[PDB]
């Protein structure tokens, strides 16, 4: 990283308090920017899910890993849920998405209610796997929410088969009165559904797939038991990358993790953290990991510096443990606080691979969490952390953990009425970075980190 | 009807404008009242339920009619839903209710609403119609909207066989954590529910039955279209009475149609309205009519009084009209404007066999009507009126009807939180009216308009 | 009129003390009733606009004419605008509306006002006189308020003939976007408009026409200064009914106008007013006036009433009134205190033969005044009253006579948001006192006046 002359601040700078100066740039157009990632993960654009029950779920993995990004499972899910995760994510179509599918004997308040489960805005009604009618939140508004599915459905909707182009689905889409298209198998079944939406991004951005051609997803392990035999059956249900994650990544116990896990040889690259320090870094690459996750208490007024005042500012932190990673070919991902585009545009000048994000994707349609509304009837959904998930381990001994135990806590995620979606976030985001390469110069990733000029600023 | 010397008021009275003045009594105790009533409607408590769609629902029909009143079904109702409705009121038992049946695959979204149905505050789970468990608010308080039935279910509750003395199933729910005994049939089968409450009344009201023994259940015609076909059609699904109802009861077009359903002969009781003048009741008993319902605008700011200054005050209508009822040997219903247990009393004791009660149980949990929840979470239910289904009868002729139609009001009848259910009402209503009697000193209805002293009070 | 058995009060009555009892009848639907009046007033309902400056407009003539009614213009209007007045309402068509007229010069700000000087709810472009576009509220919504009409006006709309089939426009509008169809000369130029609803109208109210066919309209005169030539200005302007108006009828400066506009034998019926006495009612027919206007202080709160004491509760008056010009083969005008379609009804079963409103009028897009919206952004128009301009007469004479003078009250009448105009309230007017000849048994008003039996209610 390259600062303006001068600009060596007495202090650490977090996301706030640098700036990127524009560059002599060539790029002309956000769409001659690769944003492709160079670590191994398989992502197209540097966005990869935080590994929280509430963010990674599998509604989330299957919608972020077409659009680019990847999807990490939080840890010390069940092995079987993890393979029905795994099986559902790798029989996804990388274009056509997985509709809400309604019976004609369903309710219609169950039927108004699973509606906010994906941002289509209508649900496809099936009879034995074919597709029968649509329902939109405008039939179950003022309805009986106990008359059926079947009162209030419509009976006629824009079909076309799996495979056509998704400019003749736009086309299609253009003077429907219901902008779905219900994508349907040659024997009639239903195949999902694509949306004058979802046909553009389809066209703009590349899904991450696995060698098999199948949508990617990761899976984290917490450094607690046997966490060799965890990380296979991880490996074994279908991951395409593993995320050793703790609270304090440079600890011998860590250490240990990465030792057992890289031994075994799975093949898959091996993400360890967390540590903000060049050290860390580098004893956690040595130790067996691939790609270094960086972030320890980012925030000054957070649960981890409130209680301890351990911690780093994310953006000095990523400055100095990208560089570390750099020298021993490693990858560095910045993980914690980010709240807008910018966040992300900076993590990647400073030098990280990919950017993870997770109780911003909290506030979606395609977040595990139930749809909430507080008294002014604003749509939001609760984000909550791992706690005790992250952290290294009678019934004396059970209240003597609760006792010092990191409490849970709960924030809400306000959804934006337009765009609820986890896709207009995705394009909200990659729109920022994308301007960011052109004000730089940078044509990919690796040049936005090469071209890029820093300075900082004060409080105003 | 005896008033108190001088009280001879230039105007006619309301409810509001009499009060009952005490006698020498010999009757103890509100339970050596005999509520029952002389109208050939069967019921042991003078409660009709009236004939309005946000009202006269099938779980009401159930509900009250085991309690000893009836419902009137209303008018235009499909013969179709009529005969399901009659089929399952008739085959109700006479002690044990219909709970809240849940599947082990419904959803806890499902599960939640499913319970306001019913004043019974917990749902029956089934398998193959067999119960396995229960399911109450508090099991669903938390949980995941989408979550199944099979994951809060309470496996363990009071299992006695229908039939059990409805004192003894009292006892075993003495330290039950949940109010409520889950009744089975002799070969396991769900055969229903009964709560402490329920066993009570019990053995406080009689059941109106037929000479079948099943549940007395009315239904009401128009006197548009082909009467005699319609109120034909009824007594063949199962009806035990028909009333020939309609906004203006003096008029040409409804003693044609007594005439014509009387000469029909199908031996049930004929109910005819309105009136609110002994001419009008006179004429409408010799036209074939058994009873006579009295009501056309109580309210003196209401619809009908609003827009016609048609109406008269209930108390001195019913008065008038019960005194020329009783010379044809014809009886007469009090209609409308009943708010307070009080309204029941001073129509009975104005001569009237029976009370129709209407928009009051509207706030019920055995109404149609959704429960809906304002900003302070308070629960209630809406009321609205028949509108053009009482009145007398091509997108022009539509046109020209409505301009000039009844709008249809609504209004908001609250739930009480602690007894929203419509027994908690019957439990109200005949408390006062069983209290009325002894203090006029009378065991039974036909002793109550014969022994009560009025009087005529001002505003103050 | 007839009461019931002991209602005789010791109090006169209002239109809120009594109520009409429904007797036989025979007539089946409301449109079956014939509202036309009898007191040689041309009227095909029995409503009458008030000659006040607040509501006797242009627009409020020809609106009220065309549905049957008749306003009487306010007094003291200069003889110029009179005559332009009355050849607007006499040059107007029997079925097809005037609607807003815009040039394609006029700014986005004026047609946004004057859209809500009708009830079309769309403004007319026209060129040289021929329509070529339409403009709505819509057309107008977040457009620069200078721009012009050609920017806005969407160029394709309803076109029929004048003359054509009212039902035919009717089905012609079913699926238009607009609900407004232009109706056109031979020539190509604007003949005016015609709505949906309006199309309906057409229908059910009969036009109050003069012998020539044209449209009625009447005109007021004070009793100050030449009574004589200013009545026979009126009458020679093109009025077809004449109002000698004054706050106090029965003084003897009221008695000479009349004697000086009958001698002029102008062959038109002349109403005066006011009185509430039987005396009063007496000496103005004698005096040579035709019907009578009742309306002295109706109300117990209001100015005069508080102010002098001196009044009489409406219906008593309009009672006494009325018998006591049917004796002298005159008729009797009620006026004053109309709120409801009640209060329209009570009137005539007093003896009415027509009833006039003032205020109540004044809260429609027809009413002179400008539409003016609240802090709620709610509907409103301000009425007030004649006050000088209803009593009997140097600057320092001025204010002398201002010292003592009755002062300008000024009330808020709001728009109801959906029913905004002056026809809307007459289709509520007609549809109750259509429902209370049902009630009552009579086809027409004279049966009203006679069938009709009254009683009395207390304050309950
Ligand atoms: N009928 C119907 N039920 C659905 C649908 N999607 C989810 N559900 C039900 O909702 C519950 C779980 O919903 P999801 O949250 O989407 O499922 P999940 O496997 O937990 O996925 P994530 O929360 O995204 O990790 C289960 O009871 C499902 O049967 C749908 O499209 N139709
Ligand atoms: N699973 C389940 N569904 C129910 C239950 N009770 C009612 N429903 C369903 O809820 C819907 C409407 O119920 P109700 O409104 O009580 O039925 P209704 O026949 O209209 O009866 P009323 O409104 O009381 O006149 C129907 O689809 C019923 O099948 C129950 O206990 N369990
Ligand atoms: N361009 C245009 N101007 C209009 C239109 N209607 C009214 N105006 C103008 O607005 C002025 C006031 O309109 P009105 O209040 O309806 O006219 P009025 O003669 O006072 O009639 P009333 O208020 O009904 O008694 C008129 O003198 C015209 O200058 C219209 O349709 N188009
Ligand atoms: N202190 C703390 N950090 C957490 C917890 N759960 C997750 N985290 C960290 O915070 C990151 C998410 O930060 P966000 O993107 O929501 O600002 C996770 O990827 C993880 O590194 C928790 O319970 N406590
Ligand atoms: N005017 C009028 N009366 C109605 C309407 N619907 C029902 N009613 C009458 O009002 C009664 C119910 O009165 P409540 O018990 O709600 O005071 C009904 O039994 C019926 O007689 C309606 O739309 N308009
Ligand atoms: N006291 C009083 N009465 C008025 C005034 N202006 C009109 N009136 C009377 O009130 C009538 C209108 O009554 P409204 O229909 O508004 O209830 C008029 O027809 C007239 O008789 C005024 O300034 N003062």
Same mark, same amino acid.
């Given at each position: 990283?390259?600062?303006?002359?001068?600009?060596?601040?007495?202090?650490?700078?977090?996301?706030?308090?640098?700036?990127?100066?524009?560059?002599?740039?060539?790029?002309?157009?956000?769409?001659?920017? #690769?944003?492709?990632? !160079?670590?191994?993960?398989?992502?197209?654009? @540097?966005?990869? /899910? &935080?590994? +929280? *029950? =509430?963010?990674? $779920?599998?509604?989330?993995?299957?919608?972020?890993?077409?659009?680019?990004?990847?999807?990490?499972?939080?840890?010390?899910?069940?092995?079987?849920?993890?393979?029905?995760?795994?099986?559902?994510?790798?029989?996804?179509?990388?274009?056509?998405?997985?509709?809400?599918?309604?019976?004609?004997?369903?309710?219609?308040?169950?039927?108004?209610?699973?509606?906010?489960?994906?941002?289509?805005?209508?649900?496809?009604?099936?009879?034995?796997?074919?597709?029968?009618?649509?329902?939109?939140?405008?039939?179950?508004?003022?309805?009986?929410?106990?008359?059926?599915?079947?009162?209030?459905?419509?009976?006629?909707?824009?079909?076309?088969?799996?495979?056509? #182009?998704?400019?003749? !689905?736009?086309?299609?889409?253009?003077?429907? @009165?219901?902008? /779905? &298209?219900? +994508? *349907? =198998?040659?024997? $009639?079944?239903?195949?999902?559904?694509?949306?004058?939406?979802?046909?553009?991004?389809?066209?703009?951005?590349?899904?991450?797939?696995?060698?098999?051609?199948?949508?990617?997803?990761?899976?984290?392990?917490?450094?607690?038991?046997?966490?060799?035999?965890?990380?296979?059956?991880?490996?074994?249900?279908?991951?395409?990358?593993?995320?050793?994650?703790?609270?304090?990544?440079?600890?011998?116990?860590?250490?240990?993790?990465?030792?057992?896990?890289?031994?075994?040889?799975?093949?898959?690259?091996?993400?360890?953290?967390?540590?903000?320090?060049?050290?860390?870094?580098?004893?956690?690459?040595?130790?067996?990991?691939?790609?270094?996750?960086?972030?320890?208490?980012?925030?000054?007024?957070?649960?981890?510096?409130?209680?301890?005042?351990?911690?780093?500012?994310?953006?000095?932190?990523?400055?100095?443990?990208?560089?570390?990673?750099?020298?021993?070919?490693?990858?560095?991902?910045?993980?914690?606080?980010?709240?807008?585009?910018?966040?992300?545009?900076?993590?990647?000048?400073?030098?990280?691979?990919?950017?993870?994000?997770?109780?911003?994707?909290?506030?979606?349609?395609?977040?595990?969490?139930?749809?909430?509304?507080?008294?002014?009837?604003?749509?939001?959904?609760?984000?909550?952390?791992?706690?005790?998930?992250?952290?290294?381990?009678?019934?004396?001994?059970?209240?003597?953990?609760?006792?010092?135990?990191?409490?849970?806590?709960?924030?809400?995620?306000?959804?934006?009425?337009?765009?609820?979606?986890?896709?207009?976030?995705?394009?909200?985001?990659?729109?920022?970075?994308?301007?960011?390469?052109?004000?730089?110069?940078?044509?990919?990733?690796?040049?936005?980190?090469?071209?890029?000029?820093?300075?900082?600023?004060?409080?105003?």
């Amino acid at each position: 990283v390259r600062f303006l002359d001068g600009h060596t601040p007495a202090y650490d700078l977090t996301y706030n308090d640098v700036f990127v100066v524009p560059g002599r740039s060539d790029v002309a157009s956000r769409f001659d920017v #690769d944003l492709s990632t !160079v670590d191994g993960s398989g992502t197209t654009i @540097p966005v990869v /899910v &935080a590994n +929280m *029950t =509430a963010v990674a $779920g599998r509604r989330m993995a299957e919608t972020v890993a077409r659009r680019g990004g990847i999807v990490v499972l939080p840890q010390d899910l069940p092995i079987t849920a993890v393979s029905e995760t795994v099986d559902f994510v790798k029989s996804r179509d990388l274009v056509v998405d997985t509709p809400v599918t309604l019976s004609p004997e369903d309710s219609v308040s169950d039927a108004n209610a699973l509606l906010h489960k994906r941002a289509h805005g209508a649900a496809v009604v099936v009879f034995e796997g074919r597709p029968i009618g649509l329902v939109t939140e405008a039939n179950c508004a003022g309805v009986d929410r106990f008359a059926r599915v079947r009162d209030i459905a419509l009976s006629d909707f824009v079909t076309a088969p799996v495979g056509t #182009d998704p400019r003749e !689905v736009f086309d299609l889409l253009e003077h429907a @009165p219901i902008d /779905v &298209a219900v +994508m *349907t =198998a040659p024997d $009639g079944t239903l195949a999902g559904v694509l949306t004058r939406t979802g046909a553009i991004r389809a066209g703009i951005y590349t899904p991450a797939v696995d060698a098999k051609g199948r949508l990617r997803i990761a899976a984290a392990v917490g450094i607690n038991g046997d966490v060799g035999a965890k990380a296979q059956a991880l490996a074994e249900a279908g991951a395409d990358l593993l995320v050793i994650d703790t609270a304090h990544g440079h600890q011998a116990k860590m250490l240990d993790a990465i030792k057992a896990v890289a031994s075994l040889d799975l093949g898959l690259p091996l993400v360890a953290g967390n540590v903000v320090s060049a050290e860390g870094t580098r004893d956690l690459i040595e130790a067996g990991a691939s790609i270094v996750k960086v972030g320890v208490g980012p925030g000054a007024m957070c649960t981890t510096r409130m209680m301890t005042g351990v911690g780093r500012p994310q953006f000095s932190a990523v400055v100095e443990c990208a560089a570390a990673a750099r020298q021993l070919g490693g990858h560095v991902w910045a993980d914690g606080g980010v709240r807008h585009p910018r966040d992300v545009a900076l993590a990647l000048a400073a030098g990280a691979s990919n950017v993870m994000i997770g109780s911003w994707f909290a506030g979606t349609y395609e977040s595990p969490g139930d749809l909430l509304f507080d008294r002014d009837d604003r749509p939001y959904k609760e984000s909550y952390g791992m706690a005790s998930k992250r952290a290294v381990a009678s019934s004396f001994d059970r209240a003597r953990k609760g006792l010092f135990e990191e409490g849970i806590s709960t924030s809400r995620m306000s959804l934006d009425p337009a765009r609820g979606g986890v896709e207009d976030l995705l394009d909200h985001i990659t729109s920022g970075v994308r301007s960011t390469c052109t004000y730089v110069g940078a044509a990919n990733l690796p040049e936005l980190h090469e071209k890029v000029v820093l300075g900082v600023q004060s409080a105003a």
